[PDB]
Coordinates of all heavy atoms in Angstrom, one line a residue:
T279 N 40.0 4.5 -0.8 CA 41.0 3.5 -0.7 C 41.5 3.3 0.8 O 41.7 2.2 1.3 CB 42.2 3.6 -1.7 OG1 42.9 2.5 -1.7 CG2 43.1 4.8 -1.4
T280 N 41.6 4.4 1.5 CA 41.8 4.5 3.0 C 40.5 4.3 3.8 O 39.5 4.3 3.2 CB 42.4 5.8 3.3 OG1 41.8 6.9 2.7 CG2 43.9 6.0 3.0
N281 N 40.6 4.1 5.1 CA 39.5 4.0 5.9 C 38.7 5.3 6.1 O 37.6 5.3 6.6 CB 39.9 3.6 7.3 CG 40.6 2.3 7.4 OD1 41.7 2.1 8.0 ND2 40.1 1.3 6.8
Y282 N 39.2 6.4 5.6 CA 38.6 7.8 5.6 C 38.3 8.4 4.2 O 39.0 8.1 3.3 CB 39.6 8.7 6.4 CG 39.8 8.3 7.8 CD1 40.8 7.4 8.2 CD2 38.9 8.8 8.8 CE1 41.0 7.0 9.5 CE2 39.2 8.5 10.2 CZ 40.2 7.6 10.5 OH 40.4 7.3 11.8
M283 N 37.3 9.2 4.2 CA 36.9 10.0 3.0 C 37.8 11.2 2.8 O 38.5 11.6 3.7 CB 35.5 10.6 3.3 CG 34.4 9.5 3.2 SD 32.8 10.2 3.7 CE 32.9 10.4 5.5
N284 N 37.7 11.9 1.6 CA 38.3 13.2 1.4 C 37.7 14.3 2.3 O 36.5 14.2 2.7 CB 38.0 13.6 -0.1 CG 38.7 12.9 -1.2 OD1 39.4 11.9 -1.0 ND2 38.7 13.4 -2.4
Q285 N 38.5 15.2 2.8 CA 38.1 16.3 3.7 C 37.4 17.4 2.9 O 37.6 17.5 1.7 CB 39.3 16.9 4.4 CG 39.9 15.9 5.5 CD 39.1 15.8 6.7 OE1 38.0 16.3 6.9 NE2 39.8 15.2 7.8
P286 N 36.5 18.2 3.5 CA 36.0 18.0 4.9 C 34.8 16.9 4.8 O 34.1 16.9 3.8 CB 35.4 19.4 5.3 CG 35.0 20.0 4.0 CD 36.0 19.4 3.0
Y287 N 34.7 16.2 5.9 CA 33.6 15.1 5.9 C 32.8 15.3 7.2 O 33.2 15.7 8.2 CB 34.2 13.7 5.7 CG 35.3 13.3 6.7 CD1 34.9 13.1 8.0 CD2 36.6 13.0 6.3 CE1 35.9 12.7 9.0 CE2 37.6 12.6 7.2 CZ 37.2 12.5 8.5 OH 38.2 12.1 9.4
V288 N 31.5 14.9 7.0 CA 30.6 14.6 8.1 C 31.1 13.4 9.0 O 31.5 12.5 8.4 CB 29.2 14.4 7.5 CG1 28.1 14.0 8.5 CG2 28.6 15.6 6.7
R289 N 31.0 13.5 10.3 CA 31.4 12.3 11.2 C 30.3 11.4 11.5 O 29.2 11.9 11.8 CB 32.0 12.9 12.5 CG 33.4 13.6 12.3 CD 33.9 14.2 13.5 NE 34.4 13.2 14.6 CZ 34.6 13.5 15.8 NH1 34.3 14.7 16.4 NH2 35.2 12.6 16.7
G290 N 30.5 10.1 11.4 CA 29.5 9.1 11.7 C 29.5 8.7 13.1 O 30.5 8.6 13.8
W291 N 28.3 8.3 13.7 CA 28.2 7.9 15.1 C 27.2 6.7 15.3 O 26.4 6.4 14.4 CB 27.6 9.1 15.8 CG 28.6 10.2 16.0 CD1 28.6 11.3 15.2 CD2 29.7 10.3 16.9 NE1 29.7 12.1 15.6 CE2 30.5 11.5 16.6 CE3 30.2 9.5 17.9 CZ2 31.6 11.9 17.3 CZ3 31.4 9.9 18.6 CH2 32.1 11.0 18.3
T292 N 27.3 5.9 16.4 CA 26.4 4.9 16.7 C 26.3 4.9 18.2 O 27.3 5.0 18.9 CB 26.7 3.5 16.1 OG1 25.7 2.6 16.4 CG2 28.0 3.0 16.6
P293 N 25.2 4.6 18.8 CA 25.2 4.1 20.2 C 25.7 2.7 20.2 O 25.6 1.9 19.3 CB 23.7 4.2 20.7 CG 22.9 3.9 19.4 CD 23.8 4.5 18.3
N294 N 26.2 2.3 21.4 CA 26.5 0.8 21.6 C 25.2 0.1 21.6 O 24.2 0.6 22.2 CB 27.3 0.6 22.9 CG 28.0 -0.7 23.0 OD1 27.6 -1.6 22.3 ND2 29.0 -0.8 23.8
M295 N 25.1 -1.1 21.0 CA 23.9 -1.8 20.8 C 24.2 -3.3 20.9 O 25.2 -3.8 20.5 CB 23.5 -1.7 19.3 CG 22.8 -0.4 19.1 SD 21.9 -0.4 17.4 CE 22.0 1.4 17.0
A296 N 23.3 -4.1 21.5 CA 23.4 -5.5 21.5 C 23.3 -6.1 20.1 O 22.6 -5.5 19.2 CB 22.3 -6.1 22.4
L297 N 23.9 -7.3 19.9 CA 23.9 -7.9 18.6 C 22.5 -8.2 18.1 O 22.2 -7.9 16.9 CB 24.8 -9.2 18.7 CG 24.9 -10.2 17.5 CD1 23.7 -11.1 17.3 CD2 25.2 -9.4 16.2
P298 N 21.4 -8.5 18.9 CA 20.1 -8.6 18.4 C 19.5 -7.3 17.8 O 18.7 -7.3 17.0 CB 19.3 -9.0 19.6 CG 20.2 -9.9 20.4 CD 21.6 -9.2 20.1
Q299 N 20.0 -6.1 18.2 CA 19.7 -4.8 17.7 C 20.5 -4.4 16.4 O 19.9 -3.9 15.5 CB 19.8 -3.7 18.8 CG 19.2 -4.0 20.1 CD 17.6 -4.3 20.1 OE1 16.9 -4.0 19.1 NE2 17.1 -4.7 21.1
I300 N 21.7 -4.8 16.4 CA 22.6 -4.6 15.2 C 21.9 -5.5 14.1 O 21.7 -4.9 12.9 CB 24.0 -5.0 15.5 CG1 24.7 -4.0 16.4 CG2 24.9 -5.1 14.2 CD1 25.9 -4.6 17.1
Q301 N 21.6 -6.7 14.3 CA 20.9 -7.6 13.3 C 19.6 -6.9 12.7 O 19.4 -7.0 11.6 CB 20.5 -8.9 13.9 CG 21.7 -9.9 14.2 CD 21.2 -11.3 14.7 OE1 22.0 -12.2 14.7 NE2 20.0 -11.4 15.1
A302 N 18.8 -6.3 13.7 CA 17.6 -5.6 13.2 C 17.9 -4.4 12.3 O 17.1 -4.1 11.4 CB 16.8 -5.2 14.5
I303 N 19.0 -3.7 12.4 CA 19.4 -2.5 11.6 C 20.0 -2.9 10.3 O 19.8 -2.3 9.3 CB 20.3 -1.5 12.4 CG1 19.4 -1.0 13.5 CG2 20.8 -0.4 11.5 CD1 20.2 -0.1 14.5
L304 N 20.8 -4.0 10.3 CA 21.4 -4.5 9.1 C 20.6 -5.4 8.2 O 20.9 -5.6 7.0 CB 22.8 -5.1 9.4 CG 23.8 -4.1 10.0 CD1 25.1 -5.0 10.5 CD2 24.3 -3.2 8.9
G305 N 19.5 -6.0 8.7 CA 18.6 -6.8 8.0 C 17.8 -6.1 6.9 O 17.8 -4.9 6.9
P306 N 17.3 -6.8 5.9 CA 16.8 -6.3 4.6 C 15.5 -5.4 4.8 O 15.2 -4.6 3.9 CB 16.5 -7.4 3.8 CG 16.2 -8.6 4.8 CD 17.2 -8.3 5.9
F307 N 14.8 -5.5 6.0 CA 13.5 -4.8 6.2 C 13.6 -3.7 7.3 O 12.6 -3.3 7.8 CB 12.4 -5.8 6.4 CG 12.4 -7.0 5.5 CD1 12.0 -8.3 6.0 CD2 12.6 -6.9 4.1 CE1 11.9 -9.4 5.2 CE2 12.5 -8.0 3.3 CZ 12.2 -9.3 3.8
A308 N 14.9 -3.3 7.7 CA 15.1 -2.5 8.8 C 14.4 -1.2 8.9 O 14.0 -0.7 10.0 CB 16.6 -2.3 8.9
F309 N 14.1 -0.6 7.8 CA 13.5 0.7 7.7 C 12.0 0.7 8.1 O 11.5 1.7 8.6 CB 13.6 1.3 6.3 CG 12.8 0.6 5.2 CD1 11.5 1.1 5.0 CD2 13.2 -0.5 4.5 CE1 10.7 0.5 4.0 CE2 12.4 -1.1 3.6 CZ 11.1 -0.6 3.3
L310 N 11.3 -0.4 8.0 CA 10.0 -0.7 8.5 C 10.0 -0.9 10.1 O 9.3 -0.3 10.8 CB 9.3 -1.9 7.9 CG 9.1 -1.7 6.4 CD1 8.7 -3.1 5.9 CD2 8.1 -0.7 6.0
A311 N 11.0 -1.8 10.5 CA 11.0 -2.3 11.9 C 11.7 -1.3 12.9 O 12.5 -1.7 13.7 CB 11.6 -3.6 11.9
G312 N 11.5 0.1 12.8 CA 12.2 1.1 13.4 C 12.1 1.3 14.9 O 12.8 2.1 15.5
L313 N 11.2 0.5 15.6 CA 10.8 0.7 17.0 C 11.7 0.2 18.0 O 11.4 -0.4 19.0 CB 9.4 0.1 17.1 CG 8.3 0.6 16.2 CD1 6.9 -0.1 16.5 CD2 8.1 2.1 16.3
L314 N 13.1 0.4 17.8 CA 14.1 -0.2 18.6 C 14.2 0.5 20.1 O 14.7 -0.1 21.0 CB 15.5 -0.2 18.0 CG 15.7 -1.3 17.0 CD1 14.9 -1.2 15.7 CD2 17.2 -1.3 16.6
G315 N 13.8 1.7 20.2 CA 13.7 2.5 21.4 C 15.1 3.0 22.0 O 15.1 4.0 22.6
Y316 N 16.2 2.3 21.7 CA 17.5 2.6 22.1 C 17.8 3.0 23.6 O 18.0 4.1 23.9 CB 18.1 3.7 21.1 CG 18.0 3.3 19.7 CD1 17.2 4.2 18.8 CD2 18.6 2.2 19.2 CE1 17.1 3.8 17.4 CE2 18.5 1.9 17.8 CZ 17.8 2.7 16.9 OH 17.7 2.4 15.6
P317 N 17.7 2.0 24.5 CA 17.8 2.2 26.0 C 19.3 2.4 26.5 O 19.5 2.7 27.6 CB 17.2 1.0 26.6 CG 17.5 -0.1 25.6 CD 17.4 0.6 24.3
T318 N 20.3 2.1 25.6 CA 21.8 2.1 26.0 C 22.3 3.5 26.2 O 21.6 4.5 25.9 CB 22.6 1.4 24.9 OG1 22.4 2.0 23.6 CG2 22.1 -0.1 24.8
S319 N 23.5 3.7 26.9 CA 23.9 4.9 27.4 C 25.4 5.4 27.0 O 25.9 6.3 27.6 CB 23.7 4.9 28.9 OG 24.6 3.9 29.5
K320 N 26.0 4.7 26.1 CA 27.4 5.0 25.6 C 27.4 5.0 24.0 O 26.9 4.1 23.4 CB 28.4 4.0 26.1 CG 28.6 4.0 27.7 CD 29.3 5.3 28.2 CE 30.6 5.7 27.6 NZ 31.7 4.7 28.1
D321 N 28.1 5.9 23.5 CA 28.3 6.1 22.0 C 29.7 5.8 21.5 O 30.7 6.0 22.2 CB 27.8 7.4 21.6 CG 26.4 7.8 22.0 OD1 25.6 7.0 22.5 OD2 26.0 9.0 21.8
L322 N 29.8 5.4 20.2 CA 31.0 5.1 19.5 C 31.0 6.0 18.2 O 30.0 6.1 17.5 CB 31.0 3.7 19.1 CG 30.9 2.7 20.3 CD1 30.6 1.3 19.8 CD2 32.2 2.7 21.1
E323 N 32.2 6.6 17.8 CA 32.4 7.1 16.5 C 32.5 6.0 15.5 O 33.1 5.0 15.7 CB 33.6 8.0 16.5 CG 33.7 8.8 15.2 CD 34.8 9.8 15.1 OE1 35.6 10.0 16.0 OE2 34.9 10.5 14.0

């Protein structure tokens, strides 16, 4: 019901990504199209 799970929890991460790369991961066939290479250099919790 809150933004957080019950403790203890695993922490989630992402690199910063352009919108064209976010669309490729959230799209319905994303698990096939995995060749994104990830050239970016900053991460977000």
Side-chain angles (χ1 to χ4, degrees):
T279 192
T280 45
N281 301 131
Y282 296 89
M283 292 176 280
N284 290 11
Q285 293 283 12
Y287 59 66
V288 176
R289 291 172 75 195
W291 293 98
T292 183
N294 195 342
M295 285 190 207
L297 179 281
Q299 308 301 345
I300 294 162
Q301 287 184 168
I303 296 176
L304 294 171
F307 314 143
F309 73 89
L310 298 172
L313 306 181
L314 278 72
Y316 307 119
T318 60
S319 65
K320 294 295 298 292
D321 305 349
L322 304 169
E323 192 178 356

